[PDB]
Enzyme design. Structure first.
Site, short mmCIF file in Angstrom:
data_model
loop_
_atom_site.label_atom_id
_atom_site.label_comp_id
_atom_site.label_asym_id
_atom_site.label_seq_id
_atom_site.Cartn_x
_atom_site.Cartn_y
_atom_site.Cartn_z
N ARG A 187 -5.68 -0.33 3.33
CA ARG A 187 -5.22 0.08 2.01
C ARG A 187 -4.51 -1.06 1.27
O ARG A 187 -4.28 -0.95 0.07
CB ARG A 187 -4.30 1.31 2.08
N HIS A 223 6.20 7.40 18.07
CA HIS A 223 5.43 7.78 16.86
C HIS A 223 4.25 8.65 17.22
O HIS A 223 3.86 9.49 16.43
CB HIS A 223 4.97 6.59 16.02
N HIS A 230 4.38 7.28 2.66
CA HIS A 230 5.00 5.98 2.90
C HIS A 230 4.54 4.94 1.89
O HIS A 230 3.56 5.16 1.16
CB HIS A 230 4.85 5.48 4.35
N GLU A 272 0.85 -1.18 0.00
CA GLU A 272 0.00 0.00 0.00
C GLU A 272 0.88 1.23 0.00
O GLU A 272 1.99 1.20 0.51
CB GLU A 272 -0.96 0.00 1.20
N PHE A 301 3.08 16.69 14.53
CA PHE A 301 2.67 17.00 13.17
C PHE A 301 1.42 17.88 13.15
O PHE A 301 1.45 18.99 12.61
CB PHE A 301 2.43 15.71 12.36
N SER A 342 9.16 4.98 4.81
CA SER A 342 8.39 6.18 5.14
C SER A 342 9.30 7.39 4.97
O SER A 342 10.32 7.49 5.63
CB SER A 342 7.85 6.11 6.57
#
Ligand code: HEM
Ligand code: HEM
Ligand SMILES: [Mg+2]
Lengths: 353, 353
Positions: free
Chosen positions: A178, A299, A320, A143, A306, A219
């Site tokens: 995905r 993370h 990614h 994906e 973010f 990523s």
């Protein structure tokens, strides 16, 4: 909304999503598109390793020799070059090639110039480390996710184009959804990462085979086109958190199921840095990757940081690709690398089983 | 491992989990068990509201009158009492009762001493606010999760016992998978939160009807048995994060789909604080609750802080219960409450839809 899963790869479901079909993502993301011609890709990470400064010219030349072979018949459709220093202080140049089919990569690998180079006695006498980490996921077994639409890096470069905004993102478990195979298959890990030839502790030639549903994440971060204030935002606010997380995976791999973690920076043919980077991460299972991303403070710190600065972003490129592989569709070969290199650290040795 | 879904509620699936079969959680958690006799429970939150100090004696006496009514035939099997101050400055005493069946609660509610008190014109003349928020999930429609084994609070108190260590926790989405109905149903919200009698803006008696698959979470904290060093950890490190999250939901409800958020502290019959607390949160959908918990910085802060300090905890008791209901199994009735109280705030009036 468009689906992350290609039209030709959509099928009657046996496994279902974790969101109801009213779900609408909070922001736009896109995926790579390809028709039924793209059945199974080959991702080949070709490395050169050294530790002494006086080895750099020879290592850079080796890298150039590898890139030159990429031009030959059945070379990869796309490639890029990276540099990183590992936790043993060894510098590693990795060229990643993407092939659009298995037979082309095999014809390439078995061709005289390539095969004689890899099998050469020069590889043992060069004093450099050499590796080939070669994986072949089917189209249903990978994906992609991009926070942009144009000029796709990595596997996206060998796909036919870009999707519209996709539905299956913005919630933990969306990565899994995905993967077109997720309609059917759990991608459950089974088997052992195993040495099949040689011994890591002695060096020389060592061959490692993977097990069912090893996962590989690339990523990436691209800040080349960002202006002054946005570059400052990535470098000052986002990267330190990303570095902390990469350091963690690099040094605490066995604890979380990460066989190998590399945080790499793109280079040109001369070894000069470019303003693009990525994680290359090999995981014992997709689910172990899921757990780390969604629940490890590292993370999550990246995640919340973010969204905190997300308002000041516009030119930064984040994406990614994640792949899982059948046991049989992987090979990890090493020549004169240190015992902690890639798949060598965690592979079970020939005596051990 | 044991499943969170009671054996008699396990059925052939149309909807699947988000983790493979090999999944093992990294810490132990338990759930309430009840045998095949328990078909539907009733959770009745009965409140008294006031803001003036001179109203306190009458408010506490009204609360005592409610508790006294619990001793009558068909009273709840378990109850507890709490206090909070809402964002409009009103104090709210809430007595929550749990019944093991719908008919017993109906018999109690319609019995003369109970029904006469609720329907009295004295409720209008008391000057106090009164409310009844009564919801009735089927066994397939609620889930519990305890980080302990003994002395279950809330709905666990009226269940039959405790499970062994359960599989379905430790990953976002696990809450959904603990609902037995998740095996076949998406628990998708539909319809409107609707005023069906009265007008919130005029006060007096207002009646609000829920819509399908409103979600109610009771998420609790009990530090009554902790020693000094752990008490300080909870009060100094965990509580501030929790307070921040609760204030967010209380004050930014419509933005995230939280109709009503209460952060309440247990009290004894005389209104004295006990070292137990909980959130009472009513949500427009289960999946909005999912999104917030898993991706909003407030709960992620709570979640990351917990695991940061987790080593220093041993006697702290954390748990939740989460329920969804059909429209018909929800009744939200208000007498002389301010128009931001519970489900009054976001309910649609008679002509608005
Ligand atoms: C600055 C760098 C990074 C940022 C800003 C970041 C941020 C995010 C965001 C926002 C998502 C959710 C995407 C969506 O579904 O809309 C996500 C997902 C994810 N990220 Fe990162 N990330 C970064 C680096 C990494 C790295 C280096 C890894 C390698 C392990 C990683 C692993 C994951 C995984 C496995 C998911 C999928 C979670 C799921 O859908 O279940 N990320 N990341
Ligand atoms: C100090 C208080 C809290 C702590 C330490 C905390 C911590 C956690 C932890 C560790 C989990 C994972 C449980 C597991 O599956 O093993 C979790 C899940 C969850 N929490 Fe909290 N929590 C707290 C308060 C709250 C409150 C007040 C709410 C109200 C909305 C909330 C909503 C949720 C929800 C909905 C989940 C389920 C996530 C899922 O499985 O999809 N939590 N919490
Ligand atoms: Mg398979």
């Amino acid at each position: 909304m468009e689906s992350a899963i290609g039209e030709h790869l959509q099928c009657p479901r046996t496994l279902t999503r974790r969101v109801p079909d009213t779900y609408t993502p909070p922001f736009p993301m896109w995926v790579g598109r390809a028709d039924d011609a793209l059945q199974q890709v080959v991702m080949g990470y070709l490395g050169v390793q050294f530790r002494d400064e006086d080895q750099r010219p020879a290592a850079l030349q080796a890298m150039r020799d590898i890139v030159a072979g990429f031009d030959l018949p059945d070379g990869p459709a796309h490639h890029d070059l990276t540099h990183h220093i590992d936790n043993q202080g060894y510098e590693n140049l990795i060229v990643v090639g993407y092939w659009k089919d298995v037979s082309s990569q095999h014809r390439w690998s078995t061709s005289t110039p390539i095969a004689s180079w890899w099998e050469s006695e020069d590889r043992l006498s060069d004093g450099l480390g050499f590796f080939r980490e070669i994986v072949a996921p089917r189209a249903e077994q990978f994906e992609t996710l991009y926070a942009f639409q144009e000029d796709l890096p990595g596997v996206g470069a060998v796909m036919d184009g870009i999707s519209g905004e996709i539905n299956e993102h913005g919630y933990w478990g969306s990565m899994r959804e995905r993967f077109p195979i997720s309609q059917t298959d759990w991608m459950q890990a089974s088997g052992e990462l195993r040495v099949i030839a040689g011994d890591p502790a002695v060096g020389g030639r060592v061959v490692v085979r993977g097990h069912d549903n090893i996962a590989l994440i690339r990523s990436g971060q691209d800040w080349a086109d960002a202006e002054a204030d946005e570059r400052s935002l990535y470098l000052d606010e986002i990267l330190p958190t990303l570095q902390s997380g990469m350091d963690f995976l690099r040094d605490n791999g066995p604890a979380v199921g990460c066989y190998s973690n590399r945080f790499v920076r793109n280079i040109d043919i001369d070894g000069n840095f470019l303003d693009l980077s990525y994680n290359i991460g090999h995981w014992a299972s997709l689910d172990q990757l899921e757990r780390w991303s969604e629940s490890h403070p590292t993370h999550l710190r990246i995640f919340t940081t973010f969204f905190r600065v997300a308002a000041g972003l516009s030119k930064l490129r984040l994406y990614h690709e994640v792949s899982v592989f059948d046991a049989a569709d992987q090979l990890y070969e090493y020549i004169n690398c240190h015992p902690g290199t890639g798949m060598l650290r965690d592979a079970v040795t020939i005596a051990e089983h």
